[PDB]
Amino acid sequence: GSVQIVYKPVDLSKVTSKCGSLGNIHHKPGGGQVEVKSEKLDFKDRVQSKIGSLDNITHVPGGGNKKIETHKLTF
Amino acid sequence: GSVQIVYKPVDLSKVTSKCGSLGNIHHKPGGGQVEVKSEKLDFKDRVQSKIGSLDNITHVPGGGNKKIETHKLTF
Amino acid sequence: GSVQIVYKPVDLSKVTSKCGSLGNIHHKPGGGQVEVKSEKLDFKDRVQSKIGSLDNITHVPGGGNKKIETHKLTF
Amino acid sequence: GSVQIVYKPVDLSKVTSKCGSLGNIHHKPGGGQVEVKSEKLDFKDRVQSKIGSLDNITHVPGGGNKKIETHKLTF
Amino acid sequence: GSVQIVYKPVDLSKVTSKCGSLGNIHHKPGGGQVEVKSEKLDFKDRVQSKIGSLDNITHVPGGGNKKIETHKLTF
Amino acid sequence: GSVQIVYKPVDLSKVTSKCGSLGNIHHKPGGGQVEVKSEKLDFKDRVQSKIGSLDNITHVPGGGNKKIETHKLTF
Amino acid sequence: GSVQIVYKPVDLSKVTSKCGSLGNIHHKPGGGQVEVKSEKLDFKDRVQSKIGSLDNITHVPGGGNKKIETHKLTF
Amino acid sequence: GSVQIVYKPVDLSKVTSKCGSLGNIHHKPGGGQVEVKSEKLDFKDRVQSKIGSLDNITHVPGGGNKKIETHKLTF
Amino acid sequence: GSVQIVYKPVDLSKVTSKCGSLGNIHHKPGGGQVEVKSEKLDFKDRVQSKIGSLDNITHVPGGGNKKIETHKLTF
Amino acid sequence: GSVQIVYKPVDLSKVTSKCGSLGNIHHKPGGGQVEVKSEKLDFKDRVQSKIGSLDNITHVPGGGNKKIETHKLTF
Amino acid sequence: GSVQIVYKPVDLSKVTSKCGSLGNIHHKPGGGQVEVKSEKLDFKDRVQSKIGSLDNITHVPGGGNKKIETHKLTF
Amino acid sequence: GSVQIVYKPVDLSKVTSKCGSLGNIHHKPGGGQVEVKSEKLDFKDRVQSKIGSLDNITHVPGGGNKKIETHKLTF
Numbered sequence: 001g002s003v004q005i006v007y008k009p010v011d012l013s014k015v016t017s018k019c020g021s022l023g024n025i026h027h028k029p030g031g032g033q034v035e036v037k038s039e040k041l042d043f044k045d046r047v048q049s050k051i052g053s054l055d056n057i058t059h060v061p062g063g064g065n066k067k068i069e070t071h072k073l074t075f
Numbered sequence: 076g077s078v079q080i081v082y083k084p085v086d087l088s089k090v091t092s093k094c095g096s097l098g099n100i101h102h103k104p105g106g107g108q109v110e111v112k113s114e115k116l117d118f119k120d121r122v123q124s125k126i127g128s129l130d131n132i133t134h135v136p137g138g139g140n141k142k143i144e145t146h147k148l149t150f
Numbered sequence: 151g152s153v154q155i156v157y158k159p160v161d162l163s164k165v166t167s168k169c170g171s172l173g174n175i176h177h178k179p180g181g182g183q184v185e186v187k188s189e190k191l192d193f194k195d196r197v198q199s200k201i202g203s204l205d206n207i208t209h210v211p212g213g214g215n216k217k218i219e220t221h222k223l224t225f
Numbered sequence: 226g227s228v229q230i231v232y233k234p235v236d237l238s239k240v241t242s243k244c245g246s247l248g249n250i251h252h253k254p255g256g257g258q259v260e261v262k263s264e265k266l267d268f269k270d271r272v273q274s275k276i277g278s279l280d281n282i283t284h285v286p287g288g289g290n291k292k293i294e295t296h297k298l299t300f
Numbered sequence: 301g302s303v304q305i306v307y308k309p310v311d312l313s314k315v316t317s318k319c320g321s322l323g324n325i326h327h328k329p330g331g332g333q334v335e336v337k338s339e340k341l342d343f344k345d346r347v348q349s350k351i352g353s354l355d356n357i358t359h360v361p362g363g364g365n366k367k368i369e370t371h372k373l374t375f
Numbered sequence: 376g377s378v379q380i381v382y383k384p385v386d387l388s389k390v391t392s393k394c395g396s397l398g399n400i401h402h403k404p405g406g407g408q409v410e411v412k413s414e415k416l417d418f419k420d421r422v423q424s425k426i427g428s429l430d431n432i433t434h435v436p437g438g439g440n441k442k443i444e445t446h447k448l449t450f
Numbered sequence: 451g452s453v454q455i456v457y458k459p460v461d462l463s464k465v466t467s468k469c470g471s472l473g474n475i476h477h478k479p480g481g482g483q484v485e486v487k488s489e490k491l492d493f494k495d496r497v498q499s500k501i502g503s504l505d506n507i508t509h510v511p512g513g514g515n516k517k518i519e520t521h522k523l524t525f
Numbered sequence: 526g527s528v529q530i531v532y533k534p535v536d537l538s539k540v541t542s543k544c545g546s547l548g549n550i551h552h553k554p555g556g557g558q559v560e561v562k563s564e565k566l567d568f569k570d571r572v573q574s575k576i577g578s579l580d581n582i583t584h585v586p587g588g589g590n591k592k593i594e595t596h597k598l599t600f
Numbered sequence: 601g602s603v604q605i606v607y608k609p610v611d612l613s614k615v616t617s618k619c620g621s622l623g624n625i626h627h628k629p630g631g632g633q634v635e636v637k638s639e640k641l642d643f644k645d646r647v648q649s650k651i652g653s654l655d656n657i658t659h660v661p662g663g664g665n666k667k668i669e670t671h672k673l674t675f
Numbered sequence: 676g677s678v679q680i681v682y683k684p685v686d687l688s689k690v691t692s693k694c695g696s697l698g699n700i701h702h703k704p705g706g707g708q709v710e711v712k713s714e715k716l717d718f719k720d721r722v723q724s725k726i727g728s729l730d731n732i733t734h735v736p737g738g739g740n741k742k743i744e745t746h747k748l749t750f
Numbered sequence: 751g752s753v754q755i756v757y758k759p760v761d762l763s764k765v766t767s768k769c770g771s772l773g774n775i776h777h778k779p780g781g782g783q784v785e786v787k788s789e790k791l792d793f794k795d796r797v798q799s800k801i802g803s804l805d806n807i808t809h810v811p812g813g814g815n816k817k818i819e820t821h822k823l824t825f
Numbered sequence: 826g827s828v829q830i831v832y833k834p835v836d837l838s839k840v841t842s843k844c845g846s847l848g849n850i851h852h853k854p855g856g857g858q859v860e861v862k863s864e865k866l867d868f869k870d871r872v873q874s875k876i877g878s879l880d881n882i883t884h885v886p887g888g889g890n891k892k893i894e895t896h897k898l899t900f
Binding site: 001002003004005006007008009010011012013014015016017018019020021022023024025026027028029030031032033034035036037038039040041042043044045046047048049050051052053054055056057058059060061062063064065066067068069070071072073074075 | 085089
């Protein structure tokens with residue numbers, strides 16, 4: 001028989017932020033030492049890997065708002 | 076027989092933040108030391124891995140609001 | 151029989167941010183030492199890998215808002 | 226009248242060490258964080274000072290034997 | 301009247317060391333962070349000072365034996 | 376009256392070392408971060424000062440034996 | 451609803467002085483001595499300050515009458 | 526509704542002085558001595574300051590007869 | 601909505617002074633000594649300062665009558 | 676009859692002082708006030724006079740030894 | 751009859767001082783005030799006079815030793 | 826009869842001073858005020874006079890030693 005599919009997501013949305021001031025932010029890691037030694041590693045699909053990282057991150061987005069959507073239809 | 080599917084999510088929404096001031100934030104890890112040694116690792120699908128990480132993070136978004144949605148239809 | 155598919159996402163959305171001032175941000179790593187030694191690595195598909203990283207990152211986007219969408223229809 | 230002083234230490238002495246191997250010694254300081262805050266330093270005689278030092282020492286003498294002697298005569 | 305002094309120390313002494321091997325010695329400082337804050341420094345006699353040092357030392361003498369002697373006569 | 380001084384130290388003394396091999400010695404400082412802040416310095420007599428040093432030393436003498444003597448006679 | 455404010459202060463007043471003579475006034479300060487010692491001054495807001503002053507004042511107004519008035523209305 | 530503000534201060538006032546003579550006024554400071562010692566001064570906002578003054582002053586107004594009035598209305 | 605504001609200060613005021621004579625005023629400072637000593641003078645906003653002044657002043661205004669008024673309306 | 680007078684005083688004397696060091700002296704008079712009121716000052720023979728003085732004296736002689744003698748003969 | 755006078759005073763005398771150092775001496779008068787009032791002065795023989803002085807003296811003689819003598823014979 | 830007078834004073838005397846160093850002497854009068862008021866000043870013989878002085882004196886003689894003598898004979 002006849003198959004009728006209607007997919008219509010409707011969105012009216014606002015992700016909003018107001019900040020009078022961002023500042024006077026201090027992040028103070030002292031340099032550093034790292035060592036990695038390896039024989040066999042076997043990564044086969046979508047593998048995300050961090051080994052021996054010594055990461056310092058400072059992230060001050062004035063907004064930093066995120067909107068994420070996934071729309072999927074399968075037949 | 077005939078199949079009729081209607082998918083219509085309707086969204087009217089606001090994610091909001093108001094701040095007079097963000098500031099005077101201090102973060103103080105001592106530098107650092109890391110060692111990793113490996114023989115055999117076997118990651119086969121979507122594996123997310125951190126080994127021996129020494130990560131310092133400072134994250135001060137003025138907003139930082141998140142809106143996340145998933146819409147999925149399957150036949 | 152006849153198959154009719156209608157896919158029509160409708161979106162009116164705003165990711166917005168107002169900041170009066172971004173400033174006086176200090177991030178203070180002093181260099182460093184890194185060593186990596188390897189024999190066999192076997193990365194086969196979509197593998198993302200970081201080994202022995204010593205990353206200092208400073209990121210101050212005036213906005214930094216993100217809107218991400220994925221739309222998929224499969225038959 | 227007569228004063229006679231005779232002084233005579235006689236020393237036969239041996240300070241000895243034997244070691245088969247001085248090795249596989251690891252000194253791996255994990256970093257550190259130090260802060261000092263002051264009004265005045267006002268150092269007027271024979272002051273020895275360290276302020277905010279973060280000093281690492283590794284000392285592996287193959288012998289490291291010490292012999293110390295003092296002879297003093299006063300009249 | 302007569303004063304006679306005889307001062308005659310006699311020394312036979314040996315400071316000795318035997319080592320089969322000095323090695324495989326690692327000194328690997330993980331960095332570090334130091335801060336010092338002051339108004340005045342006012343150093344007026346024989347002051348020895350270190351301010352804010354971050355000093356690494358590796359000292360592996362094959363012998364490193366020490367002999368110290370002092371002889372003093374005062375009249 | 377007569378003053379007679381006779382001063383005769385006699386020394387046969389040996390500071391001696393054997394090492395079969397010096398080697399495979401690693402000195403690997405992971406950097407570092409130092410800050411010093413002041414208004415005035417006022418150093419007036421015999422002052423020894425180090426400010427903000429970041430000093431790495433490696434010292435591997437094949438002998439490194441020391442013998443020190445002082446002889447003083449005062450009238 | 452309707453709001454009516456009527457503010458009507460009425461002032462009929464006299465500040466009066468009669469003097470047969472203002473005079474034969476002697477101010478003869480006998481000199482003086484003042485000493486002040488300090489490390490730092492750190493003035494951050496609205497200070498009215500006098501430090502170590504030795505100030506002589508003679509003030510002889512013939513009338514010197516003072517009238518001070520304030521009228522304030524807020525809505 | 527209708528807002529009506531009427532502000533009508535009425536002032537008839539006299540500050541009056543009668544003096545038969547202003548005079549024969551002597552101000553004769555016997556000198557003086559002042560000393561001030563400091564290291565740093567850090568004035569950041571609206572400071573009115575006098576340091577180490579030896580200020581003499583004579584003020585003989587014939588009237589000297591001040592009237593001060595504000596009138597403020599705010600909406 | 602409908603507003604009215606009416607402001608009508610009516611002032612008939614007089615500062616009056618009668619003096620038979622202004623005179624025979626002597627200001628005779630016997631000198632003086634001032635010393636002021638400092639390292640740094642950081643003045644950052646609206647600062648009024650006097651340092652080490654030896655200031656003599658004389659005033660003999662014939663009237664010196666003062667009338668000060670301020671009229672302020674804000675909406 | 677015949678008169679014989681012999682006047683022969685003999686003086687052998689020493690006025691001595693030994694000082695290692697003279698110093699660190701402050702004389703800081705706090706000002707002062709004097710008034711003296713008189714009619715007639717008839718001074719007729721050998722008068723030494725001070726009237727209404729305000730005198731300050733500082734006297735630090737390295738020796739300051741005084742020897743005074745008087746020898747008088749009358750017939 | 752015959753008059754014989756012998757007047758023969760004999761002096762061998764020493765006024766002595768030894769000083770290692772004179773110094774660091776301070777005199778700081780705080781001004782002062784003096785008034786003197788008289789009708790008549792009538793000084794008739796050998797008068798020494800001071801009237802109304804305000805005198806400051808600093809006197810630091812490296813010796814300042816004094817030897818004073820009078821030798822008088824009258825007939 | 827015959828008059829024989831012999832006046833023969835014999836003097837061998839020394840005023841001595843030894844100083845290793847003269848220095849660092851400070852004299853700083855803060856002014857002062859003097860007034861003197863008189864009608865008639867009749868001074869008739871050997872008068873020494875000071876009226877209304879305001880004198881500052883600094884005297885640092887390297888020796889400043891004084892030897893004073895008076896020798897008088899009358900018949």
